[PDB]
UniProtKB/Swiss-Prot annotation, chain A:
It comes from Saccharomyces cerevisiae (strain ATCC 204508 / S288c) (Baker's yeast). It comes from the Eukaryota. It is found in: Nucleus, Nucleolus. The chain holds residues 460 to 496 of 534 of the full protein. Present with 15400 molecules/cell in log phase SD medium. This is Protein BFR2. Belongs to the AATF family. Involved in endoplasmic reticulum to Golgi transport. Involved in a protein-transport step blocked by brefeldin A, which disrupts the Golgi apparatus and its incoming protein flux. May also be involved for mass growth or cell proliferation. Induction: Up-regulated during cold stress and following nutrient replenishment by dilution of cells fron exhausted to fresh minimal medium. The lineage of its organism: Eukaryota, Fungi, Dikarya, Ascomycota, Saccharomycotina.
From Swiss-Prot, chain C:
This is Small ribosomal subunit protein uS17A. The keyword Transmembrane does not apply. Component of the small ribosomal subunit (SSU). Mature yeast ribosomes consist of a small (40S) and a large (60S) subunit. The 40S small subunit contains 1 molecule of ribosomal RNA (18S rRNA) and 33 different proteins (encoded by 57 genes). The large 60S subunit contains 3 rRNA molecules (25S, 5.8S and 5S rRNA) and 46 different proteins (encoded by 81 genes). Signal peptide: none annotated.
From Swiss-Prot, chain E:
GO terms for molecular function: structural constituent of ribosome. GO terms for biological process: maturation of SSU-rRNA from tricistronic rRNA transcript (SSU-rRNA, 5.8S rRNA, LSU-rRNA); translation. There is a cross-link at residues 103, 118, 162 (Glycyl lysine isopeptide (Lys-Gly) (interchain with G-Cter in ubiquitin)). This is Small ribosomal subunit protein eS6A. The gene is RPS6A. The keyword Electron transport does not apply. It is found in: Cytoplasm; Nucleus, Nucleolus. Its main location: cytoplasm. Signal peptide: none annotated. Present with 66000 molecules/cell in log phase SD medium. There are 2 genes for eS6 in yeast. It comes from Saccharomyces cerevisiae (strain ATCC 204508 / S288c) (Baker's yeast). The lineage of its organism: Eukaryota, Fungi, Dikarya, Ascomycota, Saccharomycotina.
Curated annotation (Swiss-Prot), chain F:
Disulfide bonds: none annotated. Belongs to the eukaryotic ribosomal protein eS8 family. Keywords: Cytoplasm, Phosphoprotein, Ribonucleoprotein, Ribosomal protein. Component of the small ribosomal subunit (SSU). Mature yeast ribosomes consist of a small (40S) and a large (60S) subunit. The 40S small subunit contains 1 molecule of ribosomal RNA (18S rRNA) and 33 different proteins (encoded by 57 genes). The large 60S subunit contains 3 rRNA molecules (25S, 5.8S and 5S rRNA) and 46 different proteins (encoded by 81 genes). It comes from Saccharomyces cerevisiae (strain ATCC 204508 / S288c). The keyword Transmembrane helix does not apply. GO terms for cellular component: 90S preribosome; cytosol; cytosolic small ribosomal subunit. PANTHER family: 40S RIBOSOMAL PROTEIN S8. This is Small ribosomal subunit protein eS8A. One of its GO terms (biological process) is translation.
Amino acid sequence: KGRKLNYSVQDPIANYEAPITSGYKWSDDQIDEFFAG
Amino acid sequence: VLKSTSANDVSVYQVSGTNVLEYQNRVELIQDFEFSEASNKIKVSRDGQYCMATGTYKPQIHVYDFANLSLKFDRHTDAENVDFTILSWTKSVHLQNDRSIQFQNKGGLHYTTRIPKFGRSLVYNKVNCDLYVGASGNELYRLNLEKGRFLNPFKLDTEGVNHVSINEVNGLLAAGTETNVVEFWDPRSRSRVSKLYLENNIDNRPFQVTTTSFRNDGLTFACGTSNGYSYIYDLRTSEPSIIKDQGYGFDIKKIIWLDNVGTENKIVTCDKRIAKIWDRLDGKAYASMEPSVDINDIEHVPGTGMFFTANESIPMHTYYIPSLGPSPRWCSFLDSIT
Amino acid sequence: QSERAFQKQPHIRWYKNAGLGFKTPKTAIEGSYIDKKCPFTGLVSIRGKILTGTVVSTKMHRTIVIRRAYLHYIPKYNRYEKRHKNVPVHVSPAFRVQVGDIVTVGQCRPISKTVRFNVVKVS
Amino acid sequence: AAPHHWLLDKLSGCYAPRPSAGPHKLRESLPLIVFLRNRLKYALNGREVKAILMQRHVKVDGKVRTDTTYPAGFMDVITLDATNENFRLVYDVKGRFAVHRITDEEASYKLGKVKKVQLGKKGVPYVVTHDGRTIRYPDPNIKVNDTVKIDLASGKITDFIKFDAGKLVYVTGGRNLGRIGTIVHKERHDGGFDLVHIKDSLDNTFVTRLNNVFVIGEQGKPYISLPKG
Amino acid sequence: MKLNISYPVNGSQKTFEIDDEHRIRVFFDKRIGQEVDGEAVGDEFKGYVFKISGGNDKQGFPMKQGVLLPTRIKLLLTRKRKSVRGAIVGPDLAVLALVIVKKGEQELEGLTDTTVPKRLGPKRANNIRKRLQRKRHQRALKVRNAQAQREAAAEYAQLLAKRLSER
Amino acid sequence: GISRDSRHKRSATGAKRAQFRKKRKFELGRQPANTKIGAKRIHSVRTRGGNKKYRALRIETGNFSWASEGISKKTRIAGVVYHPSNNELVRTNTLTKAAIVQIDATPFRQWFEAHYGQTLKIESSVESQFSAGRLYACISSRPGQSGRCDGYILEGEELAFYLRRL
RNA sequence: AUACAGUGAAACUGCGAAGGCUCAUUAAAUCAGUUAUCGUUUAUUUGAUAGUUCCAUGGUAUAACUGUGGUAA
RNA sequence: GAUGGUAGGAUAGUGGCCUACCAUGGUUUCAACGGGUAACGGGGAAUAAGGGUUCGAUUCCGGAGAGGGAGCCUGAGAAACG
């Protein structure tokens, strides 16, 4: 289990991308009233 | 004028087939489209050019510029690939047959990391930026591109998963397992929401679901199998489905929608030898795309009616449908030759 | 005597002789032991030089860690500081070597990263 | 830039002649330019030793072999047509190449240490020597380090000298390089310092290797003639 | 535009500087190999048909037969990135090459009525139409090589047999 | 592949401060060509002068050997069920050396009926495959180096030697 | 010397150049000798080393070359 | 991959060189592993000179580089000064 699942932090991917604020065009209330069931 | 195969009252064309006066009336679209005797996986980027085709022996990356009709480069990667995605333009992430993951850049090979078990599929999340990678066993991992950490891997069932996909407009994480359960996780909560089971009427042997897909309405889900049987799903009475046996039926690998061009409610299914296309709400075949060799997978270019396969021969086939749509702006005399 | 897959067998029960003053025990000529890298039946051939010494540890299987103290005529501080050496070595079906046990080995065909020697004698 | 064996005077030049490839190794041979030009002095420079090589006077091992850097190693009988020059060159006692002059019935042959006997392909016994004369079919009792006698008109082995305790041996290699006397002792070890030991004027003792020694005859009767002083 | 025209069987070729581009516009958006009529490029050459065979544009860049995209693109040729104009002809060709495969209604005092001959007759025997002593010597040296080698091999194998009998 | 050198890794003593060298030509690790089933395509690569090496990727016509008589005859390939040099290799169904792959044994039926007359002394758990058609057989040849698929059939002892495993 | 016949610009060919500066500091891991490779590659050097045949000579496709041209090149 | 075992991959082949599985090993006070320079100096690396006694002949400081990293190709030999 040596090289298997190193839970470390890696240098070039720490800022490889950037997030997005709104993201999903739905609402989270639309998620809840989408899969209530 | 390129020849057309017979079909149900409809026409398709191939460019760069196994057969494709002919030398002096050549109809070659993309120069140097041939690999080392097979093809792994082809997909077209989000913008209007720069398609990427993974390699076969000494496997490469093969980015083709559509506005130059030829090859840009071929980064001979270290191992043979199975699955990758493209992250806009120049960045892309890959995983090979061994449990390693490459990050290609403009300079190429920005990093090589690993996952602890052998992986089978990769998808990227546009929202908060964590790639989900499906592998063998209890383990569906994350590599977040925010801060490069690892995340608390998603606890699966026994054997594993053949394909993972997230929904686009709302984010519903699919994971096609082996024991017919589809294991929908929530990309918000990091927990399960449902464990939907897949049924049939023939039941040859305990099939495994191999292809998962969604579209940009966020309400339906296209499901596959290891038997050649397409499935549709909705939340509306989610226990049954509509099914599609295919006339040869080995393993369907690519099921993709037509949710961004005209001639709507249509979907492409693709198993090992044939790729067909049918309509929703009836289940009747619009057309089919029978080549002269097997298919490793396919892809469909957005906005227009053309398809790009990755197969087991030396070139790759492109399939043009002059009834689904036109040929794109960089191929804007295909409608003049045929 | 079969705890692994892939047809554990001799590779053409089988028997040979390296010669050069080293016996082959009768179970190593005709016995159920496979002798994959033990040089009497083996796949390896003998060459080179033969070194002798006692052991330190035989903890893992197919690892015989020899010690080898030897005389060297030191001219610097005009006294002999005592030598010590180590070499890992694969097993043989002739002696379960315990601590002590001056044995000798012959050079052949690198088996792991650091072993070129395999046991040929116990006395 | 020279070795010790050539007997090469230091006031000669800057670049030393590398021998070309051939029968013997680089480290145990002298080429024809260092033979003819600056040892027994049939030339004055490389131009005229190439001139007499184009004229083809040299007849080493019964063939002409017109080349400047042809590596004549141990006891290749250099034969020169004018003034019937027959030269067997052996080792002296201090490491150089002593080139003895011999006659025609002695230059009609040479001898060679056998290196290995092989069942190579198609049931053919097989023998090699230091010039690599792969000659067909000796007897089965050719061990390593015995001595064949080459025909030098055809290639066949004519006589055979068995390596055992009580044979006249020549040592070419290590710190015993070029000694004769072959009897104080025999000691075959199992991988090194294994040999037959050689006497001196006071019958001193010496250690060498098996491959660094090879037999030339018997205790008093070698059919090679040897130089003296 | 300039039109290079070639009558191949007579061996004639000449360029013609044709202005007045609505005569030229018959060739537009027709790639290499597709035929054409004389009727919409001219009136004085009617019943004429020309297979186009490429052409250098202004800036001199050639077109190779049958790719796409009548602008310029950067391909990989005999392998390095060379610039090559597309096979389709548009408004910006300097010269355009043509092969006339049927004479129509007017004789041409450059193409039809004047012609050149060929170069020189053939040289090979079969090209003119459409040793044995070496065959003696080859066979003789071959059977002599057999009667030397395959007999000498057994002739020292019998010496091995003598050594084995004496051993 | 990458390499063949001890310089990138630690020895039996535990050393550090490697930072050694630009890797040479003679540390050449080529890519692992996992040979599969397809249409027969062998890449002819070069090494060490004119040392052509046959790198097989999609070989079919396996020459598999009847064991008790040693009859190497021609057949097809189905799939490897057990090969724990990589337990994902049998999930992906490749074809490497020492793998146990399944064969439609119809030419072995032809040879038995041709040199024995009747159809069916041989073991029963391989007589079941004599009847059905698919027999287990293990690859000997190296398609990644010699480009060929040769093998030996499973007959009795070696059969149960693998059937008790998986 | 009425199918070749000497000078020979420019083209194919055989080979030529067959081993040259600056910059950051490795403790038998850089180096030197030595053991071995039936554990391996090898142009050139050298010695050796080939046995399956039913009812007078095989095909177009490219040069150089001519000819028509484009481009500032 | 630390130490070894079994098999495969790649190799010019030997080789945890790389990967699956398994065992928890291995070096060390008989000096492990680590600390620096008159490591522009040293180690015979070599020629020695008929009186210079650590000046006094040379191979090599370490590896790289052909604007910068990356990928590929050629050859008996290369990760090419072309």
